[PDB]
Every structure is written in structure tokens, then in C-alpha cells.
């Protein structure tokens, strides 16, 4: 009897395993900008600067 | 009176051919084997 029980357990734990295909998708979009403008001044004879 | 062997798993009898009639009746009476009860069960968890 115990044999016929454990064969019915083994029968149901022996099943095939499905297999998943995991496909990640990573999207990284960067963008940048900048505008740096300015006027400087100087006189080195008598040192005076902007 | 009564005997059996579980080498053979067999009722032996000591007594009447009336004991032979009724105790072939009880030879037959409890010979039956209970149907499987699914005493144990393997359950497939869906989530947990």
C-alpha cells in the first residue's frame, strides 16, 4: 500500500517543467545643452579687470 | 477454533463443517480491500 502511495506521489512530482524566456529591455536616453557666453575686460598697465 | 498464517495470509480453522460453512462464510466476509482514499495529495501552488 505505501508503495502504491509513493508511486502516485512520484508520478505527480515528476512532471515536466515549462521554461520562460525573460527578455529585458533597457532604454536610456540622455540629452544635454548649454550656452556659456560673456565678455571680460582687462588693463594690465594698472591692473584692472572685469 | 481459529488460526491463520501471514506467511500465506490464510485463515486456518479448527472445528465443525458447520464451522466450515459459517467460517467459509467469514473467509469470504472480510476479504474486502478498502478503495484508495487519496490519503496523501500533491498540490500544485499557483502563486505562493
Closest CA to A8 of B34, B48, B37: B37
Tell me how the structure was determined. cryo-EM
Phi, psi of B32 (to 5 degrees): -65, 145
The SS3 call for residue A42 is: strand
Is A2 at the interface with chain B, CB within 8 A? no
CB contact at 8 A, B3 and B11: yes
Cell numbers of A27, please? 532604454
Contact (CB<8Å) B40/A5: yes
Contacts of A48 (CB under 8 A, 6+ apart): A42
Amino acid at each position: 500500500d505505501i508503495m502504491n502511495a509513493m508511486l502516485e506521489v512520484i508520478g505527480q512530482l515528476d512532471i515536466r517543467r515549462a521554461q520562460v524566456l525573460i527578455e529585458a529591455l533597457i532604454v536610456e536616453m540622455a540629452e544635454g545643452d548649454g550656452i556659456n557666453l560673456g565678455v571680460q575686460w582687462g588693463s594690465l598697465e594698472s591692473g584692472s579687470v572685469i | 477454533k481459529f488460526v491463520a498464517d501471514e506467511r500465506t495470509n490464510s485463515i486456518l480453522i479448527s472445528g465443525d463443517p458447520k464451522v466450515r460453512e459459517r467460517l467459509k462464510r467469514l473467509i469470504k466476509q472480510l476479504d474486502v480491500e478498502m478503495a484508495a482514499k487519496g490519503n496523501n495529495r500533491v498540490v500544485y501552488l499557483k502563486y505562493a
